[PDB]
């Protein structure tokens, strides 16, 4: 009998939350931005093509300097490229070839990787010897790691396929805080510009907002009908965008706790693998399963352009800190730097 | 280019040479994906996923065991698009045991793996384990408990043939792939020999398809 009462209380709380969200929504973002000048057309060209991978590329991450980028692939390799000159700087062979995520430290000293091995391995790039050594192998997750992000040189936040995200202390190798609440596998992670509160998207068609210190869920966003694969904060930290298998991108605001706009096209029936914003945030670059990337005017839900040129699925794309370039990875073992 | 630019280019070229060498070395190495519901002893041992490397007659084998990954398969099964073959282990003694029937759950998993959109052309090696126990417990219990429409002799050979036929009859698109079935014995590494034969046949088919004379 108590279970029924608890379920009724939970349903009442959910109804109250829905009523509050409905009340807070008066004018749509499309209504407000109807009276702005649309972007005419975006025509980016492949400035560089980074070759050398012999397997599907599952992850990439730009550096803070916006010149060096890290890649991960099934060939058990993790390459740091010089994008300006197309020169390989390091070629780190991973102990596990099943890598699904890669990260670049903001300071540039370390890179991280993870995958089916249930380990986030930190690699020290700047050592007295000329090789990159494994700083340590972080363990504790039960499911595959989907996204690892550096907060600083000592703290790394990871998303796993055991429905829990974790915050680590690299010096001690211990989980400082474990985040719980997701029913499904967590497939995405994005840190706020202040590195203060981050958001994760899971396969329960929900996105949850966390705090690194307190380790509890501030907000829950539920708009999607399928599995969220990628997530990205707005540059101001007050909004984030999600990509899901139902061929729709959605914009959520943290303060209003609601979905503002949805990005969808009739000709698009494939899923979304990676989403990123421009430096200003008006362009939403989303990768897709149909071998190409799309540029969406984030304020008008209009397709500004298409980044075609990949012969297989686009798995990871990133936009540099200075906003000059966009680098898209694909399963055809080819990176391409756009403008 | 400057002096450091030239030296960086030379370093990148050395990295490219090493990458090409590693790719050539890893292209001839056979990748196997081991699944079950089941029986892994003597086949995988002789958190995370388990990597097993062994060599049989000038071929290097990698077998991946993903049984410890307790998550949704649809988000990590595409990592095994290029595996040479899928080794699937089904126990024959689970027809009368419940974890739905154990054998029926095994058949459902086999159907999902065989008809997955990533393995439309990936051969499956079906190892039917515990044949000694199945022969021991088949006289005292008929297969009608698992398959009510058996209508056949309750002997070891007929029962095994029926199980095998039910297993390859779940293989739609039965033109681009052959399912290899073997009842696991423990003499003279016959399981390894069967895996070798299946893998070399698959290698021949792949080479012929690549060369454009298929």
């Amino acid at each position: 009998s108590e279970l029924d009462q608890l379920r009724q209380e939970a349903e009442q709380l959910k109804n109250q939350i829905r009523d509050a969200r409905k009340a807070c929504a008066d004018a749509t973002l499309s209504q407000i931005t109807n009276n702005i000048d649309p972007v005419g057309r975006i025509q980016m060209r492949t400035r560089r093509t980074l070759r050398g991978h012999l397997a599907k590329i599952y992850a990439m991450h730009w550096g803070t300097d916006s010149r060096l980028l890290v890649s991960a692939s099934q060939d058990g390799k993790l390459i740091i490229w010089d994008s300006y000159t197309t020169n390989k700087v390091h070629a780190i062979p991973l102990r596990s070839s099943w890598v699904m995520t890669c990260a670049y430290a903001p300071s540039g000293n370390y890179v991280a990787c993870g995958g089916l091995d249930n380990i986030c391995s930190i690699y020290n790039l700047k050592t007295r010897e000329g090789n990159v050594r494994v700083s340590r192998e972080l363990a504790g997750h039960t499911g595959y790691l989907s996204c690892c992000r550096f907060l600083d040189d000592n703290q790394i936040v990871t998303s796993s396929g055991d429905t829990t995200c974790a915050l680590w202390d690299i010096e001690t190798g211990q989980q400082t805080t474990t985040f719980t609440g997701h029913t499904g596998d967590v497939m995405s992670l994005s840190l706020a510009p202040d590195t203060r509160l981050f958001v994760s998207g899971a396969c329960d068609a929900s996105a949850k907002l966390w705090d690194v210190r307190e380790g509890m869920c501030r907000q829950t966003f539920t708009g999607h009908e399928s599995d969220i694969n990628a997530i990205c904060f707005f540059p101001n930290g007050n909004a984030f965008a999600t990509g899901s298998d139902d061929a729709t991108c959605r914009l959520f605001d943290l303060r209003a706790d609601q979905e503002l706009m949805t990005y969808s096209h009739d000709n698009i029936i494939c899923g979304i693998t990676s989403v990123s914003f421009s430096k200003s945030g008006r362009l939403l670059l989303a990768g897709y399963d149909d071998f190409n990337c799309n540029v969406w005017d984030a304020l008008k839900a209009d397709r500004a352009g298409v980044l075609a040129g990949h012969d297989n699925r686009v798995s990871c794309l990133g936009v540099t800190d200075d906003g000059m370039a966009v680098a898209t990875g694909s399963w055809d073992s080819f990176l391409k730097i756009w403008n | 280019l400057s002096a450091e630019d030239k030296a960086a280019v030379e370093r990148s070229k050395m990295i490219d040479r090493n990458l090409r060498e590693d790719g050539e070395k890893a292209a001839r190495e056979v990748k196997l994906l081991l699944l079950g519901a089941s029986g892994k002893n003597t086949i995988v041992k002789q958190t995370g996923i388990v990597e097993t490397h062994f060599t049989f007659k000038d071929l290097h084998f990698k077998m991946f065991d993903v049984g410890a990954q307790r998550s949704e398969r649809k988000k990590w099964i595409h990592c095994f698009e290029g595996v040479t073959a899928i080794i699937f282990c089904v126990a024959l003694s689970d027809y009368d045991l419940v974890l739905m029937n154990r054998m029926h759950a095994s058949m459902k998993l086999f159907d999902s793996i065989c008809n997955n959109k990533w393995f439309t052309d990936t051969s499956i090696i079906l190892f039917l384990n515990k044949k000694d126990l199945f022969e021991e417990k088949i006289k005292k219990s008929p297969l009608t408990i698992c398959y009510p429409e058996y209508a056949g002799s309750n002997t070891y050979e007929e029962a095994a043939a029926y199980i095998q036929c039910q297993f390859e009859d779940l293989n739609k698109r039965k033109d681009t792939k052959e399912i290899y079935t073997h009842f696991t014995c423990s003499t003279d590494t016959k399981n390894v020999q069967f895996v070798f034969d299946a893998v070399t046949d698959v290698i021949i088919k792949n080479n012929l398809k690549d060369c454009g004379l298929f």
Partner: single-chain antibody
Amino acid sequence: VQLVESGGGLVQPGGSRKLSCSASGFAFSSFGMHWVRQAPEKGLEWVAYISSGSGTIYYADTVKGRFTISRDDPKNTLFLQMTSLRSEDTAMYYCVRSIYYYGSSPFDFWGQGTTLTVSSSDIVMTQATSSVPVTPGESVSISCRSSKSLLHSNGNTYLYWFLQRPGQSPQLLIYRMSNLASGVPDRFSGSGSGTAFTLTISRLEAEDVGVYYCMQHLEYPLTFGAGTKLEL
């Protein structure tokens, strides 16, 4: 990380000797290596250079055709074969580690150095000052000049600042301008542009006493400047 050399000794003029350097503590296969020689009372001079993989070699014009440089990666050793030794080849020979990628720190480590005694176009680096007197707790600026501008089209200026402590091998302080080498205290700074460079020490201590040398890596004669000696 350490480099030790061997050989040296008294060589009759016109003879030949093979200097060898042993590398320990680092991935010797991945670093290009240099030979920098110092006269018994003069500045540093660059002799030869062998790259990673033994795919790119250079010699100084004063030792070209008479010296041979080769490395043995499995043994972590390096050699410098000399033919037709002259009285001008007497010097203390140093082996220098140098790795070249983006953001690298070339000339980071220097060997102890072995002495060789023999019985009896190119960018010029100018360090006009010498025997500059210093007092502890005071700031000192050291100048350096180049015949050709060291600012490449990519924005990288190639000026290497070194520190020759009395009785010790040179230590890298600044590799590219305003790039402080690892392990160097954060009181050293580099500034300048084109053909003019300065090195500023915030508060010089007893360990900052020595001879400071320049380098250009723009081309492949590697030229130094007669160092400026700081004395208490």
